[PDB]
């Protein structure tokens, strides 16, 4: 009920002048009331980040400060930024502010939740290491995932990011009752849109029927003041965790990306006259990562897993902004730009991703010993490719002519086809289980599926549905 | 404005506010400014060699023969002890702005070739409320005669609204010639 | 573009001009308003603008 | 080579036309100076029943 | 040239209708003066961004509000602005007069024109620091804008609405793949919008002589602020260029617009931000540059059906230090743009010109820029040079080796013949399906490298005269149908045997 003054404005920061008694504390949401071009209202929606002494914060504007006047009046709203959460955000873009911005109506809401909070107890966390299940067969092999873990794309455009995003939001939502909520923290508006309309089209986001839609959105774009990209990374998660501790789900988050999260907090913290850390870094970086970080948990109730991308700065992992969020990470999952150009889909690197939850108290030794085979069977063959382009196959040795045809059949099985391009490709995609993972590889490797072709496993779910596409193609071949 | 010398001024309206003595600590306030003008006497205050305890003996001396209000001498005694003797020239002028605003009264300022009567006075007085929300209203006269025959006034809560006609016409149609 | 260069040209030959016979205008109007009475301009003179300022506050 | 000579010739004669109009229309403009005063008469006269409401 | 019989009604017609209207204005007095920088007590009811006007006529925007001062950079030389004067808040933020009629005409950063042609005809303004479209105004970039280089428009190629980067280190023509760009668009209906931040004032004139010879000057507007200039109107001069490629675009008219270096409105924004005391960070930059930058850039996008389909295409420059692709600048701008493009001395120097490392530059629209005769052709211009970029090693042992690595050498060394252009001379896309077909197709193995540049230039003038239907089927259905690889093969095994006789 407080009413403040704009003390002054400098960029996007603003310092607010309060009555002594009546005092915002730090982080809650300052709404200016501001005046716009023509002269009607439109108000500025701000958080306090410094208690300046002498009854004067110091805000970050999470809106444009163009056109704000020293002395107007500032609504002290007692809370920090609160965002509408629930099964009204499922399908529709927000704002910084938790406001759509995809012109698609207002929120018919009764739920906010504030972006600020503590982590989930040490009493509440889910100590049992489970295994996420995704559905892929590269992943579910070679790079597991947590259930509540964090996870790196090492990824760029045209890898197939953007189809391999949309696959995890379809296979939770169906293999489990899951949602997802994608955060495009200081993200590209062309690219922004890009991505709405392909979750349109592959009918994550029901355009027709929505609230029968499996993301949220919220996107913070590049040309929002530091202050707004700086909280978009925790409006996605407040959103993430309502359907985590309420309706007890597993959610996705997505930070697309992580550094951009990094970069927007160093810029922030310039701002505000912070002498910064080595390399330019906000000093508190490993804190305003930690933040966010271990609010991203498995609890007794449900489990966020959130797949986050990662850009190297430099490429340099020492660098401490991948060196602050690869301590957080558990598993990397690199995509290949090489990879894709051989038509593999998804373009997953089974080589360069890693996981923690590969090891055998974990998954098993049956899982973990198929895992070893896989990776020593396609290093082999990295090895070879200099020699079958001097020798040719004939030449190599019979051991060693098993581990190249092998190998070759381990690289078609390895892809997939998805549900998300079932317009684009016309292929019905396949949910592959851990399950049906395992003995799919066990098969290749103990070489009982030595008669078959190389291309009856592109492409192909199970592996009993490698062998359909062999027997198909033996009958396409003799008519 | 949040400066050090509005900081403490803004402090002496405020006790002085408390125990309904603003007319008469005002007028002490008005009455340290002829003092402190004084190159000699300011510079004796003001400078930290001379030793602090000298400087008590005097000022109480002062104060005296003053006779000022007891929070005032006070006040200076505060200064004092604390360092920021050297910026009680912008602490007095500060207190005037805040007085001013304690008593929900407000400044203008008019200027003229020649000089003007008392209605004209009151009635833009009255204009000055209006459109500023004087609780009351305040007024002063400072004779330039490099304009023509209008008047300026200069109001706000810093020297900063203006409003005028008497060269801005001739200024005016020079910029609305060249469009 | 030649030609384009000379209209210019007229139109600055022109717009300096009307500037210099202005300003020979103005220095003429202001010796001749300093050159008359004061009592008898002015006090019409505040009374009107005076009016006219609680005209505009009104207004 | 020719066609560009030829062009830098008549360039030179554009130029001299130019200086040629200049030069007339700067006299012009002091002819119209040094002319033209009970415009300038009439033109304070008109503004000091303008200034004075 | 009559002046003195109207002289006599103008004075008595600007007197006329003169409204005389007393308003309230903030006014303020000057604090202090210095380096372009103007401290005001008072403007008590100024908003941040404002022009402020001086004695003397200065303007300057207040953009430090504080609680002592207004900080106001001057927008101009303050030499005669005086401790104590006057000064008051205009009551507007950043305007232009904007219109069709600045097509050709060189202006400044408050678009008044510097060619020396007369004033320019504006009836609308649009605002300088005016917000990008949002996520629901745009469409995904599928048109392109073809640069007339062979390099970028087949391999790095840019749509219409892409934010495309030209970057590498000094003299390395970054300058020429933008205006070359500029140049190509003759026949296609862009406006195109050529802002040059910091140059050289000698250069500035020599882009706008090379314009105007080639009749670019016809669809093109110069925002210039050379060097000798203040920083603020430095900092604001791609804020105005951009104010006038969104005129165009709102009006339906697909824009181009090159920023002649980024580098140096980052440098012109700091040197106000230091000097109005903001904190600074990594190179003294404020922490606002990325927001500087991204402000400008992302309002250059595609826009919808619903708003009519206007783009704008940037290109912004950005010079890199001896290859400093992680400096702090190029940093931002890298993140903030979709595609680079990576221009290397170290082929500039060798011949490679336009000296594109097409290896490390990259386009995220991708293949949804070209049309789909181009997408057919430029799929083996891809492949074939990523297999000679992995046997650059090999280039020195080709005698030692098996036929079908040692083809690839040869493919390859003349795929790179194929990228070649000198400057000023942008090719048609049907120039360019041509030149990428021969040389994809195995019909250059048979010449030597002195002759390859020979040969395509006889080639494209060969179909341009005497197989003019291959035109009009590239042209209308944008596809490198059966007819027309008939109709092209028929022109090369033509010219092959003309060549060869010589
Ligand atoms: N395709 C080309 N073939 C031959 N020369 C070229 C080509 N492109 C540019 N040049 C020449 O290279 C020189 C540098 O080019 P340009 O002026 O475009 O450089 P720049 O990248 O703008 O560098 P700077 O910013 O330092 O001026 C120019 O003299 C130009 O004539
Ligand atoms: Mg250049």
Redesign the pocket.
């Given at each position: 009920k407080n009413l403040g003054r704009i003390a002054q404005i400098i960029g996007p920061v603003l310092d607010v002048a309060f009555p002594p008694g009546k005092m915002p504390n730090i982080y809650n949401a300052l709404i200016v009331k501001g005046r716009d071009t023509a002269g009607q209202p439109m108000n500025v929606t701000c958080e306090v980040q410094q208690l300046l002494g002498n009854n004067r914060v110091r805000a970050v504007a999470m809106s444009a400060t163009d056109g704000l006047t020293r002395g107007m009046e500032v609504i002290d709203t007692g809370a920090p930024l609160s965002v509408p959460v629930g099964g009204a955000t499922l399908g529709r873009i927000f704002n910084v502010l938790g406001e759509p911005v995809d012109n698609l109506g207002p929120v018919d809401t009764r739920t906010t939740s504030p972006i600020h909070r503590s982590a989930p107890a040490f009493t509440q966390l889910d100590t049992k290491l489970s295994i996420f299940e995704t559905g892929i067969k590269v992943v579910d092999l070679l790079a597991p995932y947590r259930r509540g873990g964090k996870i790196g794309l090492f990824g760029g455009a045209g890898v197939g990011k953007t189809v391999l995003i949309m696959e995890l939001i379809n296979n939770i939502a169906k293999a489990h009752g899951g949602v997802s909520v994608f955060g495009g923290v200081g993200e590209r508006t062309r690219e922004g849109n890009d991505l709405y309309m392909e979750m349109k089209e592959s009918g994550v986001i029901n355009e027709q029927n929505i609230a029968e839609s499996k993301v949220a959105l919220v996107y913070g774009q590049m040309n929002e003041p530091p202050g707004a990209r700086m909280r978009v990374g925790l409006t996605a998660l407040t959103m993430a965790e309502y359907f985590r501790d309420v309706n007890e789900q597993d959610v996705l988050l997505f930070i697309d990306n992580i550094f951009r999260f990094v970069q927007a907090g160093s810029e922030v913290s310039a701002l505000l006259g912070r002498m910064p850390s080595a390399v330019g870094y906000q000093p508190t970086l490993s804190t305003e990562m930690g933040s966010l970080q271990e609010r991203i948990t498995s609890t007794k109730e449900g489990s966020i897993t959130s797949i986050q991308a990662v850009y190297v700065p430099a490429d340099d992992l020492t660098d401490p902004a991948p060196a602050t969020t690869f301590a957080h990470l558990d598993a990397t999952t690199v995509l290949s730009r090489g990879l894709a150009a051989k038509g593999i889909y998804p373009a997953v690197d089974p080589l360069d991703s890693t996981s923690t939850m590969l090891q055998p108290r974990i998954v098993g030794e049956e899982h973990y010993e198929i895992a070893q085979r896989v990776k020593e069977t396609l290093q082999r063959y990295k090895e070879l490719q200099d020699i079958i382009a001097i020798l040719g196959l004939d030449e190599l040795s019979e051991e060693d002519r098993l581990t190249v045809a092998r190998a070759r059949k381990i690289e078609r099985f390895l892809s997939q086809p998805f549900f998300v391009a079932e317009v684009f490709t016309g292929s019905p995609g396949k949910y592959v289980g851990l399950a049906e993972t395992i003995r799919g590889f066990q098969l290749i490797l103990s070489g009982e599926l030595d008669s078959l072709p190389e291309q009856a496993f592109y492409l192909v779910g199970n592996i009993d549905e490698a062998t359909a596409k062999a027997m198909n193609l033996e009958m396409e071949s003799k008519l | 404005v949040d400066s050090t010398a509005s900081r403490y001024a803004s402090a002496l309206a405020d006790v002085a506010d408390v125990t309904g003595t603003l007319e008469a600590t005002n007028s002490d306030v008005e009455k340290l400014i002829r003092i402190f003008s004084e190159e000699p006497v300011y510079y004796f205050f003001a400078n930290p060699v001379i030793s602090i305890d000298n400087k008590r003996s005097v000022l109480d001396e002062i104060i005296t023969t003053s006779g000022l209000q007891p929070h005032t001498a006070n006040f200076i005694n505060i200064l004092i002890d604390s360092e920021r003797i050297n910026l009680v020239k912008e602490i007095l002028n500060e207190f005037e702005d805040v007085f001013n605003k304690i008593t929900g009264t407000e400044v203008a300022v008019v200027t003229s070739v020649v000089k003007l009567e008392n209605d004209h006075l009151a009635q833009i007085a009255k204009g000055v409320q209006k459109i500023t929300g004087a609780k009351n209203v305040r007024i002063k006269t400072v004779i330039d005669p490099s304009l023509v025959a209008g008047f300026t006034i200069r109001y706000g809560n810093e020297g900063s609204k203006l409003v005028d006609m008497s060269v801005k016409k001739q200024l005016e149609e020079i910029a609305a010639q060249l469009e | 573009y030649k030609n384009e260069t000379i209209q210019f040209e007229q139109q600055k030959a022109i717009n300096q001009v009307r500037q210099r016979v202005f300003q020979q205008a103005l220095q003429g109007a202001l010796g001749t308003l300093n050159s008359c009475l004061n009592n008898e301009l002015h006090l019409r003179t505040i009374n009107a603008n005076i009016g006219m300022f609680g005209a505009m506050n009104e207004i | 080579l020719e066609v560009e000579a030829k062009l830098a010739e008549g360039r030179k004669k554009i130029e001299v036309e130019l200086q040629e109009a200049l030069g007339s229309l700067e006299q012009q403009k002091e002819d119209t100076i040094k002319s033209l005063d009970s415009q300038i008469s009439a033109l304070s006269d008109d503004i000091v029943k303008k200034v004075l409401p | 040239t009559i002046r003195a019989d109207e002289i006599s009604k103008i004075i008595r017609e600007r007197i006329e209708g003169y409204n005389r209207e007393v308003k309230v204005v903030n006014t303020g007095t000057v604090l202090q003066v210095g380096d372009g920088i103007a401290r005001i007590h008072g403007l008590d009811e100024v908003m941040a961004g404002e022009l402020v006007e001086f004695e003397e006529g200065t303007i300057g925007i207040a953009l430090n509000l504080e609680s002592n001062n207004v900080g106001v950079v001057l927008m101009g030389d303050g030499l005669m602005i005086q401790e104590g004067s006057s000064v008051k808040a205009t009551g507007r933020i950043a305007q232009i007069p904007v219109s069709e009629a600045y097509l050709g005409r060189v202006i400044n950063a408050l678009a008044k024109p510097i060619d020396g042609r007369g004033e320019i005809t504006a009836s609308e303004s649009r605002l300088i620091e005016s917000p990008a479209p949002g996520i629901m105004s745009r469409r995904s970039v599928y048109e392109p804008l073809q640069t007339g280089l062979i390099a970028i428009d087949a391999m790095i190629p840019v749509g219409r609405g892409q934010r495309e980067l030209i970057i590498?280190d000094?003299?390395?023509?970054?300058?020429?793949?933008?205006?070359?760009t500029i140049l190509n668009q003759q026949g296609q209906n862009v406006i195109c919008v050529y802002v040059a931040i910091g140059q050289k004032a000698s250069?500035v004139a020599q882009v706008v002589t090379n314009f105007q010879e080639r009749g670019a000057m016809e669809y093109t507007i110069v925002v210039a602020e050379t060097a000798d200039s203040p920083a603020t109107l430095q900092y604001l001069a791609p804020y105005t260029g951009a104010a006038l490629a969104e005129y165009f675009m709102y009006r339906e008219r697909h824009t181009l617009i090159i920023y002649?270096?980024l580098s140096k409105q980052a440098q012109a924004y700091r040197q106000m931000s230091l000097l109005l005391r903001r904190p600074p960070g990594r190179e003294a930059y404020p922490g606002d540059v990325f927001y500087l930058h991204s402000r400008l850039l992302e309002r250059a996008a595609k826009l919808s059906s619903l708003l009519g389909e206007g783009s704008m295409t940037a290109l912004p420059?950005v010079?890199t230090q001896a290859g400093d692709v992680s400096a702090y600048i190029p940093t931002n701008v890298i993140s903030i743009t979709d595609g680079q493009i990576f221009?290397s001395a170290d082929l500039?120097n060798a011949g490679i010109?336009?000296?594109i490392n097409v290896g490390i530059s990259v386009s995220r629209v991708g293949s949804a820029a070209q049309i789909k005769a181009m997408k057919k052709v430029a799929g083996k211009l891809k492949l074939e040079l990523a297999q000679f970029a992995e046997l650059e090693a090999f280039a020195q042992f080709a005698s030692d080796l098996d036929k079908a690595t040692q083809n690839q050498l040869a493919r390859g060394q003349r795929l790179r013949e194929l990228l070649?252009?000198?400057?000023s001379a942008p090719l048609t896309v049907e120039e360019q399906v041509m030149t990428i077909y021969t040389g994809t197709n195995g019909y250059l193995d048979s010449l030597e490298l002195d002759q390859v540049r020979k040969y395509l230039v006889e080639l494209r003038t060969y179909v341009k005269t005497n197989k003019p239907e291959f035109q009009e089927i590239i042209s209308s259905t944008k596809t490198f149908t059966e007819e027309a690889e008939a109709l092209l093969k028929e022109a090369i095994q033509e010219q092959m045997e003309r060549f060869l006789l010589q």
């Open positions: - | - | - | - | 590498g000094r003299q390395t023509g970054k300058t020429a793949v933008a205006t070359d250069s002649d270096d420059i010079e221009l500039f010109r336009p000296a070649k252009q000198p400057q």
